[PDB]
Amino acid sequence: QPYDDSHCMERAERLIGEIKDMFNESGKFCGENAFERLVMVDKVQRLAIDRHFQNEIAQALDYVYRYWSDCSRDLNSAALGLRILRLNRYPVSSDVLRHFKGNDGQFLCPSAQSEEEKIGSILNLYRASLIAFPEENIMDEAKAFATTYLNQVLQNNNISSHLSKEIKYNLEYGWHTNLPRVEARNYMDIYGENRSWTEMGGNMQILNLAKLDFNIMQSVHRLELESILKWWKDSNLDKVDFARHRHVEYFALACAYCIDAKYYAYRRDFAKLCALATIVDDIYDTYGTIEEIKLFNEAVKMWDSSLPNSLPENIKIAYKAFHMAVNESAEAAKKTQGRDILPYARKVWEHYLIGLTKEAEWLANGYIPSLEEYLENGAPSSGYRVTMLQPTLTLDALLPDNILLEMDYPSRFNELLCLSLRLKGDTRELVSGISCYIKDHPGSSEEEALDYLKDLLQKRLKELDQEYLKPNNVPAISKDHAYNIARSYQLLYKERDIKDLVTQILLEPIPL
Ligand SMILES: [Co+2]
Ligand SMILES: [Co+2]
Ligand SMILES: [Co+2]
């Protein structure tokens, strides 16, 4: 009532309506148009406006799945449908790609395809090979073939500017070091600069909706950011000295996948609890007397609002801030989960502190654990879970304790999410992943240790993806946010260019 819809909102809402009709008109086509509907899903998904079309996408992919044997007629559509159906939790098999594997590990495109068309087919093959489950060797071969092919294309040049952009973006970001709005922001340029694409009927409404949605939500997020800057000053964290301005980066990361304005608690608390978790980790592994690490743990165990009025100011303010943010976040989760969750949340942070303390003792005692023992403790100690649990509970998907146990600790899902952070970090100091491996394998070089931990991460990511897309009673929106937390950390390590991410997501609108 007191605030009107802005001009861009009205325009966006009109475009949403016209595009739903495009989905419905397409579903009125008498005949098998599985590919046409797939490609429309593709566009609205790459541009991260797919949350406005959940019913229409469900209908379109249900139909594509029904006709999967008729839709997978060539390399392009097989690869395109394989990725999109897999990512939307249809049980599709990487076997579809075997129909195109020739000899010498090569994959076959329709002979009549233009050079541009063939490259588009290999790009979708590359894009599909990144969502690989354990022991799908066809995926490893597709990745290898497509990487070689697209690089040779980039070497040989002689291709258009927008298609070269697309190859470069896909080759650089892949899937695990990536996020929806990051892909969307690139495809706004990749599609918008393709004249043939923008003239194809309907595409311009799709692209305009994508730009509009991006600019509309970015200004909601830039506003929310204000309340986070205020919190950084009121909580006196700006004067912790050993801290860092990472709260803005962490906020921008969460904005690149958690979009709707109603989820302001998720974006806020991820930024807060991840900045805090980072600070706590510095206190334990760097700026904290072994006495205070004890008083910290004790304070947490009791849930004191305050540390003893005698400790350093740095440690004292972090604790007070930590205590407050955990409470406020749990208050938010009460409203949406419909119960008390502060008890459970304290246990989550306790398991995190246990993990950090054990690494402190190890350093203090000169003890180098086996790699297996390091990784097991390295999961709680990586801090993934404490940045995931409480913010995810503030979404509007209910998670009763019996459902939570299939997403949170001790589930395989959470474990593979923690390992992704630990192994990625430890491949980017007495007790590390590298050192524990050398202790386990006497005479192993650093090169040999680092090479092993990288393969382990690759295997763990495949397990993660298979576990992520396996169906169960967990609301997908909860799994998706948890999964994208892990990706944001992979992306963060890739970028440590991170200032560009913050500019793109929060500060710089896209011209329409
Ligand atoms: Co406007
Ligand atoms: Co087949
Ligand atoms: Co640290």
Coordinates of C-alpha atoms and ligand atoms in Angstrom, one line a residue:
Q1 CA 0.0 0.0 0.0
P2 CA 2.5 2.7 1.0
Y3 CA 5.2 1.7 -1.5
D4 CA 4.3 1.2 -5.2
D5 CA 5.9 -1.2 -7.6
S6 CA 8.7 0.4 -9.4
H7 CA 8.8 0.8 -13.1
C8 CA 11.3 -2.1 -13.6
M9 CA 9.2 -4.4 -11.4
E10 CA 6.1 -3.9 -13.5
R11 CA 8.1 -4.4 -16.6
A12 CA 9.7 -7.6 -15.2
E13 CA 6.3 -8.9 -14.1
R14 CA 4.9 -8.3 -17.5
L15 CA 7.8 -10.2 -19.1
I16 CA 7.4 -13.0 -16.6
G17 CA 3.8 -13.4 -17.9
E18 CA 4.7 -13.3 -21.5
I19 CA 7.3 -16.0 -21.0
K20 CA 5.0 -18.3 -19.1
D21 CA 2.8 -18.1 -22.2
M22 CA 5.8 -19.0 -24.3
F23 CA 6.1 -22.1 -22.1
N24 CA 2.4 -22.9 -22.3
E25 CA 2.1 -22.2 -26.1
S26 CA 5.1 -24.5 -26.6
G27 CA 3.2 -27.2 -24.6
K28 CA 0.2 -26.8 -26.9
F29 CA 2.4 -27.8 -29.9
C30 CA 0.9 -31.0 -31.2
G31 CA 4.0 -33.1 -31.8
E32 CA 7.3 -33.9 -30.1
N33 CA 9.0 -30.6 -29.4
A34 CA 11.2 -31.9 -26.5
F35 CA 14.2 -30.0 -27.7
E36 CA 12.4 -26.7 -28.1
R37 CA 11.1 -26.8 -24.6
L38 CA 14.5 -28.0 -23.3
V39 CA 16.3 -25.0 -24.9
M40 CA 13.8 -22.6 -23.4
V41 CA 14.5 -24.0 -19.9
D42 CA 18.2 -23.7 -20.6
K43 CA 17.9 -20.0 -21.4
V44 CA 15.9 -19.1 -18.3
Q45 CA 18.2 -21.2 -16.1
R46 CA 21.5 -19.9 -17.4
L47 CA 20.2 -16.4 -16.8
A48 CA 19.1 -17.4 -13.3
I49 CA 15.5 -16.2 -13.8
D50 CA 14.3 -19.8 -13.5
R51 CA 12.8 -19.2 -10.0
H52 CA 9.9 -17.3 -11.7
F53 CA 9.0 -20.4 -13.8
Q54 CA 9.1 -23.4 -11.5
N55 CA 5.7 -24.8 -12.7
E56 CA 6.5 -24.3 -16.4
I57 CA 10.0 -25.8 -16.0
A58 CA 8.6 -28.9 -14.1
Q59 CA 6.1 -29.4 -16.9
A60 CA 8.7 -28.9 -19.6
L61 CA 11.3 -31.2 -18.1
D62 CA 8.7 -33.8 -17.3
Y63 CA 7.9 -33.8 -21.0
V64 CA 11.5 -33.8 -22.0
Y65 CA 12.2 -36.8 -19.7
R66 CA 9.2 -38.8 -21.1
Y67 CA 10.7 -38.3 -24.6
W68 CA 14.3 -38.6 -23.5
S69 CA 15.1 -41.2 -26.1
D70 CA 13.6 -39.0 -28.9
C71 CA 15.2 -35.8 -27.5
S72 CA 18.7 -37.2 -27.2
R73 CA 19.1 -37.4 -31.0
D74 CA 22.5 -35.7 -31.2
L75 CA 25.5 -34.8 -29.1
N76 CA 24.2 -31.3 -28.4
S77 CA 20.7 -32.3 -27.1
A78 CA 22.0 -35.4 -25.4
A79 CA 24.6 -33.3 -23.5
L80 CA 22.1 -30.5 -22.9
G81 CA 19.4 -32.7 -21.6
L82 CA 21.8 -34.9 -19.6
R83 CA 23.0 -31.9 -17.6
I84 CA 19.6 -30.2 -17.1
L85 CA 17.7 -33.3 -16.2
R86 CA 20.5 -34.5 -13.9
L87 CA 20.7 -31.1 -12.1
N88 CA 16.9 -31.2 -11.7
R89 CA 17.1 -34.7 -10.1
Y90 CA 15.8 -36.9 -12.9
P91 CA 17.5 -40.3 -13.0
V92 CA 19.3 -39.9 -16.3
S93 CA 22.4 -41.8 -17.2
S94 CA 25.7 -40.6 -18.6
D95 CA 25.3 -43.6 -20.9
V96 CA 23.4 -41.4 -23.4
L97 CA 26.8 -40.0 -24.4
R98 CA 28.0 -43.5 -25.4
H99 CA 25.9 -43.3 -28.6
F100 CA 28.3 -40.6 -29.8
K101 CA 31.7 -41.9 -28.6
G102 CA 33.7 -42.9 -31.6
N103 CA 37.3 -44.3 -31.7
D104 CA 40.4 -42.4 -30.4
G105 CA 38.2 -41.1 -27.7
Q106 CA 36.4 -38.7 -30.1
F107 CA 32.8 -37.6 -29.8
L108 CA 30.7 -37.1 -33.0
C109 CA 28.6 -34.0 -34.1
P110 CA 26.1 -34.0 -36.9
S111 CA 28.2 -33.8 -40.1
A112 CA 26.0 -31.0 -41.5
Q113 CA 26.7 -28.6 -38.5
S114 CA 28.5 -25.3 -39.1
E115 CA 31.7 -24.7 -37.3
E116 CA 29.8 -22.5 -34.9
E117 CA 27.1 -25.2 -34.4
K118 CA 29.7 -27.9 -33.8
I119 CA 31.4 -25.7 -31.1
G120 CA 28.1 -25.2 -29.4
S121 CA 27.6 -29.0 -29.3
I122 CA 31.1 -29.5 -27.7
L123 CA 30.4 -26.7 -25.2
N124 CA 27.3 -28.4 -24.0
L125 CA 29.3 -31.7 -23.9
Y126 CA 31.9 -29.9 -21.8
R127 CA 29.2 -28.4 -19.6
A128 CA 27.6 -31.8 -19.1
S129 CA 30.9 -33.7 -18.3
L130 CA 31.4 -31.5 -15.2
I131 CA 28.4 -33.0 -13.4
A132 CA 30.0 -36.5 -13.1
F133 CA 29.2 -39.3 -10.7
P134 CA 31.7 -41.8 -9.4
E135 CA 32.8 -44.3 -12.1
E136 CA 31.1 -42.5 -15.0
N137 CA 34.3 -42.8 -17.1
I138 CA 32.4 -41.5 -20.2
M139 CA 32.3 -38.2 -18.3
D140 CA 36.0 -38.1 -17.8
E141 CA 36.5 -38.8 -21.5
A142 CA 34.0 -36.2 -22.6
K143 CA 35.7 -33.6 -20.5
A144 CA 39.1 -34.5 -21.9
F145 CA 37.9 -34.4 -25.5
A146 CA 36.0 -31.1 -25.1
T147 CA 38.8 -29.4 -23.3
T148 CA 41.2 -30.3 -26.1
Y149 CA 38.7 -29.3 -28.7
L150 CA 37.7 -26.0 -27.3
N151 CA 41.3 -25.0 -26.6
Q152 CA 42.3 -25.8 -30.2
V153 CA 39.4 -23.6 -31.3
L154 CA 40.6 -20.8 -29.1
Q155 CA 44.1 -21.3 -30.5
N156 CA 43.0 -21.4 -34.1
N157 CA 40.9 -18.3 -33.4
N158 CA 38.8 -17.4 -36.5
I159 CA 35.6 -17.4 -34.5
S160 CA 33.2 -14.7 -33.5
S161 CA 33.7 -12.5 -30.4
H162 CA 30.6 -13.7 -28.5
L163 CA 31.3 -17.4 -29.1
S164 CA 34.9 -16.9 -28.0
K165 CA 33.6 -15.2 -24.9
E166 CA 31.4 -18.2 -24.2
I167 CA 34.2 -20.8 -24.5
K168 CA 36.5 -18.7 -22.3
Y169 CA 33.9 -18.3 -19.6
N170 CA 33.0 -21.9 -19.6
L171 CA 36.6 -23.1 -19.6
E172 CA 37.5 -20.8 -16.7
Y173 CA 34.6 -21.2 -14.4
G174 CA 33.4 -24.8 -14.9
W175 CA 30.7 -25.8 -12.4
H176 CA 32.1 -26.2 -8.9
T177 CA 33.9 -22.9 -8.8
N178 CA 30.8 -21.1 -9.9
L179 CA 27.4 -19.8 -8.8
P180 CA 24.1 -19.1 -10.6
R181 CA 24.1 -15.3 -10.7
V182 CA 27.8 -15.5 -11.7
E183 CA 26.8 -17.6 -14.7
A184 CA 23.8 -15.4 -15.3
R185 CA 25.9 -12.2 -15.4
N186 CA 28.2 -13.7 -18.0
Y187 CA 25.4 -15.0 -20.2
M188 CA 23.8 -11.6 -20.2
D189 CA 26.9 -10.6 -22.2
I190 CA 27.3 -13.8 -24.1
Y191 CA 23.7 -13.8 -25.4
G192 CA 23.2 -10.0 -25.5
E193 CA 26.2 -9.6 -27.9
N194 CA 24.9 -12.3 -30.2
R195 CA 22.8 -10.5 -32.8
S196 CA 21.4 -13.8 -34.3
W197 CA 20.4 -14.8 -30.7
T198 CA 18.7 -11.6 -29.8
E199 CA 16.7 -11.6 -33.1
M200 CA 15.4 -15.2 -32.5
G201 CA 11.8 -14.7 -31.4
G202 CA 11.2 -14.6 -27.7
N203 CA 14.9 -14.4 -26.6
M204 CA 14.9 -10.6 -26.2
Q205 CA 12.1 -10.8 -23.7
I206 CA 14.1 -13.5 -21.8
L207 CA 17.3 -11.5 -21.8
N208 CA 15.5 -8.3 -20.7
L209 CA 13.7 -10.1 -17.9
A210 CA 17.2 -11.4 -16.8
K211 CA 18.7 -7.9 -16.8
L212 CA 15.7 -6.5 -15.1
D213 CA 15.6 -9.2 -12.4
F214 CA 19.4 -8.8 -11.9
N215 CA 19.1 -5.0 -11.4
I216 CA 15.9 -5.2 -9.3
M217 CA 17.3 -7.8 -6.9
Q218 CA 20.8 -6.2 -6.7
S219 CA 19.3 -3.0 -5.3
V220 CA 17.4 -5.0 -2.7
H221 CA 20.7 -6.8 -1.8
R222 CA 22.7 -3.5 -1.8
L223 CA 20.1 -2.2 0.6
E224 CA 20.4 -5.3 2.9
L225 CA 24.1 -4.8 2.8
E226 CA 23.6 -1.5 4.7
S227 CA 22.3 -3.4 7.7
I228 CA 25.4 -5.6 7.6
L229 CA 27.7 -2.6 7.5
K230 CA 25.9 -1.2 10.5
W231 CA 26.3 -4.5 12.4
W232 CA 30.0 -4.4 11.7
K233 CA 30.3 -1.0 13.5
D234 CA 27.8 -1.5 16.3
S235 CA 29.4 -4.9 17.2
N236 CA 32.7 -3.0 17.3
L237 CA 34.3 -5.6 15.1
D238 CA 35.9 -2.8 13.0
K239 CA 38.2 -2.4 16.0
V240 CA 39.1 -6.1 16.4
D241 CA 42.4 -5.3 14.6
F242 CA 43.0 -8.9 13.7
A243 CA 39.7 -9.2 11.8
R244 CA 39.0 -8.3 8.1
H245 CA 36.4 -6.7 5.8
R246 CA 35.4 -10.3 4.6
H247 CA 31.7 -9.7 5.7
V248 CA 31.1 -7.9 2.4
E249 CA 32.6 -10.7 0.3
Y250 CA 30.6 -13.3 2.2
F251 CA 27.4 -11.3 1.7
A252 CA 28.1 -11.0 -2.0
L253 CA 28.7 -14.8 -2.3
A254 CA 25.3 -15.6 -0.7
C255 CA 23.6 -13.1 -3.0
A256 CA 24.9 -14.9 -6.0
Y257 CA 22.5 -17.8 -5.4
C258 CA 20.0 -16.9 -2.6
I259 CA 18.0 -14.2 -4.4
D260 CA 14.4 -13.7 -3.1
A261 CA 13.8 -10.6 -0.9
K262 CA 12.0 -12.7 1.7
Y263 CA 15.3 -14.7 2.4
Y264 CA 17.1 -11.7 3.9
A265 CA 17.8 -13.7 7.1
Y266 CA 19.8 -16.3 5.1
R267 CA 22.0 -13.7 3.4
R268 CA 22.5 -11.8 6.6
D269 CA 23.3 -14.7 8.8
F270 CA 25.6 -16.4 6.3
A271 CA 27.6 -13.2 6.1
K272 CA 27.6 -12.8 9.9
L273 CA 28.2 -16.4 11.0
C274 CA 30.9 -16.9 8.3
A275 CA 32.8 -13.7 9.2
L276 CA 32.5 -14.8 12.9
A277 CA 33.6 -18.4 12.1
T278 CA 36.6 -16.9 10.3
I279 CA 37.5 -14.7 13.3
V280 CA 37.1 -17.5 15.8
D281 CA 39.4 -19.6 13.7
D282 CA 42.0 -16.9 13.8
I283 CA 41.6 -16.6 17.6
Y284 CA 42.3 -20.4 17.9
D285 CA 45.1 -20.9 15.4
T286 CA 46.9 -17.5 15.8
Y287 CA 45.7 -14.7 18.2
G288 CA 44.6 -16.6 21.4
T289 CA 46.4 -17.7 24.6
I290 CA 45.8 -21.3 25.4
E291 CA 44.1 -20.0 28.6
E292 CA 41.6 -17.9 26.6
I293 CA 40.9 -20.8 24.1
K294 CA 39.8 -22.6 27.3
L295 CA 37.8 -19.7 28.6
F296 CA 36.2 -19.3 25.1
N297 CA 35.2 -23.0 25.0
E298 CA 33.9 -22.8 28.6
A299 CA 31.9 -19.6 27.8
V300 CA 30.4 -21.3 24.8
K301 CA 29.6 -24.4 26.8
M302 CA 27.7 -22.3 29.3
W303 CA 26.4 -19.7 26.8
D304 CA 27.7 -16.7 28.7
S305 CA 26.8 -13.5 27.0
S306 CA 30.3 -12.2 28.0
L307 CA 33.9 -13.2 28.5
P308 CA 35.7 -12.4 31.8
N309 CA 36.2 -8.6 32.0
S310 CA 40.0 -9.1 32.0
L311 CA 40.8 -10.7 28.7
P312 CA 42.1 -8.7 25.6
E313 CA 39.6 -6.4 24.0
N314 CA 40.0 -8.2 20.6
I315 CA 39.0 -11.6 22.0
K316 CA 36.4 -9.9 24.2
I317 CA 34.5 -8.1 21.4
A318 CA 34.6 -11.1 19.0
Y319 CA 32.9 -13.3 21.7
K320 CA 30.2 -10.8 22.5
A321 CA 29.5 -10.3 18.7
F322 CA 29.6 -14.1 18.2
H323 CA 27.2 -14.6 21.0
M324 CA 24.7 -12.1 19.7
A325 CA 24.7 -13.1 16.1
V326 CA 24.1 -16.8 17.0
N327 CA 21.1 -15.8 19.1
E328 CA 19.6 -13.4 16.5
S329 CA 20.0 -16.1 13.8
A330 CA 18.3 -18.7 16.0
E331 CA 15.5 -16.3 16.7
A332 CA 15.0 -16.0 12.9
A333 CA 15.0 -19.8 12.6
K334 CA 12.3 -20.1 15.3
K335 CA 9.9 -18.1 13.2
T336 CA 10.3 -20.3 10.2
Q337 CA 11.1 -23.7 11.8
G338 CA 8.4 -23.3 14.4
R339 CA 10.4 -24.5 17.4
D340 CA 13.4 -23.7 19.5
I341 CA 16.7 -24.3 17.6
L342 CA 19.2 -22.4 19.7
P343 CA 19.9 -25.6 21.7
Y344 CA 20.8 -27.5 18.5
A345 CA 22.7 -24.5 17.2
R346 CA 24.9 -24.4 20.3
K347 CA 25.8 -28.0 19.7
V348 CA 26.8 -27.2 16.1
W349 CA 29.2 -24.5 17.3
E350 CA 30.5 -26.7 20.1
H351 CA 31.5 -29.4 17.5
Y352 CA 33.2 -26.6 15.6
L353 CA 35.2 -25.5 18.6
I354 CA 36.1 -29.1 19.5
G355 CA 37.6 -29.4 16.1
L356 CA 39.6 -26.2 16.4
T357 CA 40.8 -27.0 19.9
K358 CA 42.1 -30.4 18.8
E359 CA 44.2 -28.8 16.1
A360 CA 45.5 -26.4 18.7
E361 CA 46.5 -29.2 21.1
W362 CA 48.2 -31.0 18.2
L363 CA 50.3 -28.0 17.3
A364 CA 51.0 -27.4 21.0
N365 CA 52.0 -31.1 21.6
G366 CA 54.1 -31.4 18.5
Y367 CA 51.8 -34.1 17.3
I368 CA 51.4 -34.7 13.5
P369 CA 48.3 -36.9 13.0
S370 CA 47.7 -39.4 10.2
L371 CA 46.0 -37.9 7.2
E372 CA 42.9 -40.0 7.9
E373 CA 42.7 -38.5 11.4
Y374 CA 43.4 -35.0 10.1
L375 CA 40.6 -35.2 7.5
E376 CA 38.1 -36.6 10.0
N377 CA 38.7 -33.8 12.4
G378 CA 39.2 -31.4 9.4
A379 CA 35.6 -31.7 8.5
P380 CA 34.1 -30.0 11.7
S381 CA 37.2 -27.8 11.9
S382 CA 36.9 -26.5 8.4
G383 CA 33.9 -24.5 9.6
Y384 CA 31.6 -25.4 6.7
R385 CA 28.8 -26.6 8.9
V386 CA 28.5 -23.6 11.2
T387 CA 28.2 -21.4 8.2
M388 CA 25.6 -23.7 6.7
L389 CA 23.3 -24.9 9.5
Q390 CA 21.9 -21.8 11.1
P391 CA 21.4 -19.7 7.9
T392 CA 19.7 -22.7 6.1
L393 CA 17.3 -23.1 9.0
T394 CA 16.1 -19.5 8.4
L395 CA 14.6 -20.5 5.0
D396 CA 11.0 -21.3 4.8
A397 CA 11.6 -25.0 4.2
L398 CA 10.9 -26.8 7.4
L399 CA 13.6 -29.2 8.6
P400 CA 12.5 -31.5 11.5
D401 CA 15.3 -33.2 13.4
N402 CA 14.7 -36.5 11.6
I403 CA 15.0 -34.7 8.2
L404 CA 17.9 -32.5 9.4
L405 CA 19.9 -35.6 10.2
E406 CA 19.9 -36.5 6.4
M407 CA 21.3 -33.0 5.5
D408 CA 23.3 -31.9 8.5
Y409 CA 25.9 -33.8 10.4
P410 CA 26.3 -36.8 10.5
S411 CA 24.9 -37.4 7.0
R412 CA 27.2 -38.3 4.1
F413 CA 26.0 -35.0 2.4
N414 CA 27.3 -32.8 5.1
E415 CA 30.5 -34.8 5.3
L416 CA 31.3 -34.4 1.6
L417 CA 30.4 -30.7 1.9
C418 CA 32.9 -30.3 4.7
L419 CA 35.6 -32.3 2.9
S420 CA 35.2 -30.1 -0.2
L421 CA 36.2 -27.0 1.8
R422 CA 39.0 -28.8 3.7
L423 CA 40.6 -30.4 0.7
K424 CA 40.2 -27.4 -1.5
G425 CA 41.8 -25.2 1.1
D426 CA 44.6 -27.6 1.9
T427 CA 45.6 -27.7 -1.8
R428 CA 45.5 -23.9 -2.5
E429 CA 52.2 -24.8 9.5
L430 CA 53.1 -28.1 11.1
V431 CA 49.7 -29.9 10.7
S432 CA 48.3 -29.6 7.2
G433 CA 46.9 -32.0 4.6
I434 CA 50.2 -32.0 2.8
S435 CA 52.3 -32.6 6.0
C436 CA 50.0 -35.4 7.3
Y437 CA 50.3 -37.2 4.0
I438 CA 54.1 -37.0 4.1
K439 CA 54.1 -38.3 7.7
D440 CA 51.9 -41.2 6.4
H441 CA 54.1 -41.8 3.4
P442 CA 57.8 -41.4 4.3
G443 CA 59.9 -39.9 1.6
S444 CA 56.9 -38.6 -0.4
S445 CA 57.7 -35.2 -2.0
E446 CA 55.5 -32.2 -1.7
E447 CA 54.6 -32.5 -5.4
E448 CA 53.5 -36.1 -4.7
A449 CA 51.5 -35.1 -1.6
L450 CA 49.8 -32.1 -3.4
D451 CA 49.0 -34.3 -6.4
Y452 CA 47.3 -36.8 -4.2
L453 CA 45.1 -34.4 -2.3
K454 CA 43.9 -32.9 -5.6
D455 CA 42.8 -36.3 -6.9
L456 CA 41.0 -36.9 -3.6
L457 CA 39.2 -33.6 -4.0
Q458 CA 38.1 -34.5 -7.5
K459 CA 36.8 -37.9 -6.3
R460 CA 35.1 -36.3 -3.3
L461 CA 33.4 -33.7 -5.6
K462 CA 31.9 -36.5 -7.7
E463 CA 30.6 -38.3 -4.6
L464 CA 29.2 -34.9 -3.4
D465 CA 27.4 -34.3 -6.7
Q466 CA 25.9 -37.8 -6.7
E467 CA 24.9 -37.4 -3.0
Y468 CA 23.6 -33.9 -3.7
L469 CA 21.2 -35.1 -6.5
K470 CA 20.1 -38.3 -4.9
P471 CA 16.5 -37.9 -3.9
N472 CA 15.3 -38.1 -0.3
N473 CA 12.9 -36.3 2.1
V474 CA 15.0 -33.2 2.3
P475 CA 13.5 -30.0 0.8
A476 CA 15.6 -29.3 -2.3
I477 CA 15.8 -25.6 -1.5
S478 CA 17.7 -26.5 1.7
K479 CA 20.1 -28.9 -0.1
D480 CA 20.6 -26.3 -2.9
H481 CA 21.7 -23.6 -0.5
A482 CA 24.0 -25.9 1.4
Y483 CA 25.4 -27.1 -1.9
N484 CA 26.0 -23.6 -3.1
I485 CA 27.7 -22.6 0.1
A486 CA 30.4 -25.2 -0.8
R487 CA 30.6 -23.9 -4.3
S488 CA 31.0 -20.3 -3.1
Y489 CA 34.0 -21.5 -1.1
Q490 CA 35.5 -23.2 -4.1
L491 CA 34.8 -20.1 -6.1
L492 CA 36.4 -17.9 -3.4
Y493 CA 39.6 -20.0 -3.5
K494 CA 39.6 -19.8 -7.3
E495 CA 39.5 -15.9 -7.0
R496 CA 42.1 -15.6 -4.2
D497 CA 39.5 -11.1 -8.7
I498 CA 37.2 -11.4 -5.7
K499 CA 36.7 -7.6 -5.7
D500 CA 35.1 -8.0 -9.2
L501 CA 32.6 -10.5 -7.8
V502 CA 31.5 -8.0 -5.2
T503 CA 31.2 -5.2 -7.8
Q504 CA 29.2 -7.5 -10.2
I505 CA 26.8 -8.9 -7.7
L506 CA 26.2 -5.9 -5.4
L507 CA 27.4 -2.6 -6.8
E508 CA 27.3 -2.4 -10.7
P509 CA 24.0 -2.7 -12.5
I510 CA 23.9 -4.1 -16.0
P511 CA 22.8 -1.7 -18.8
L512 CA 19.6 -2.8 -20.6
Ligands
CO1 CO 13.1 1.2 -14.4
CO2 CO 20.6 -45.0 -25.0
CO3 CO 43.1 -20.5 10.0

